[PDB]
C-alpha cells in the first residue's frame with residue numbers, strides 16, 4: 001500500500017504535473033501527418049487525461065502505457081465512458097522496456113513523464129519506434145535563465161538532475177536526430193489553475209481519509225513545498241513542450 005496510496009491521491013487530481021487541455025491541443029496543432037492509419041503512443045500516460053483529449057481531435061489508434069495498474073485502470077474506465085476503448089487502449093508497461101515494432105509509430109506523446117527515463121535517453125531510445133518523419137511530443141522541466149538562486153537550483157538537483165535550459169534541450173533534440181519543429185514554454189495557469197490549485201482541494205479530503213499515514217503526510221508536505229517554490233521562483237523555471245520530428 002505504500003505505492004498505491006500515492007497513486008490513489010493522483011486519481012483525485014486533474015493531472016500529475018503542469019499542463020492543460022489548451023496546451024495539449026496547441027502542441028497537437030504542430031502534428032500534420034495524422035490519418036486513420038496512424039499509430040499513436042502515450043508514454044507515461046498516467047490517468048490518460050491528456051490521452052482522451054488527443055483521441056478526440058485526431059484519427060488513429062492510441063495506446064497508453066504507464067507503470068501503475070491503478071492509473072491504467074482509470075484510463076480504460078474513462079476511455080469506455082467516452083466509447084473510445086475501441087481505438088484507445090490502456091496498458092501497463094515501462095518507458096524503457098518497450099516492445100513496439102521498430103519504425104511503426106507516427107506519433108509518440110508523453111506529458112511530464114520523460115524525466116523517468118531521462119530526457120536525452122528518451123530521445124535516443126524512443127526514436128527507434130517512430131516511422132521516419134514521425135513526431136515525438138513531450139513536455140519537460142526547463143530553466144528560463146542561465147543563472148538561478150541557490151535554493152531553486154539545489155531543489156531540482158535533488159529531484160530531476162536533467163532539468164536544463166531551452167537552448168540545451170533543443171540542442172539535444174537535434175543531436176538525437178530530430179528537427180525541433182516546435183518548442184514552447186507552458187503558461188502559468190498550467191501550474192496554478194490546472195495543477196497546484198486542484199491538488200490542494202484534494203489534499204484535505206484525502207488526508208482525513210488516511211489520517212495518521214506518514215506516507216500521505218510526507219506527500220502533502222511535499223506538494224506545499226513545490227507549489228511554494230514555484231510562486232517564489234516561477235521566473236527562473238517552468239515547463240516547455242517540445243515537438244520533435246524524426247530525421248534521417
Ligand SMILES: CC/C(C)=C\Cc1cccc(O)c1O
Nearest residue numbers: 006016017112115116159160
Ligand atoms: C514517484 C516519485 C518520482 C519517481 C516521481 C516524482 C517526480 C519526479 C520528477 C518530476 C515529477 O513531476 C514527479 O512527480
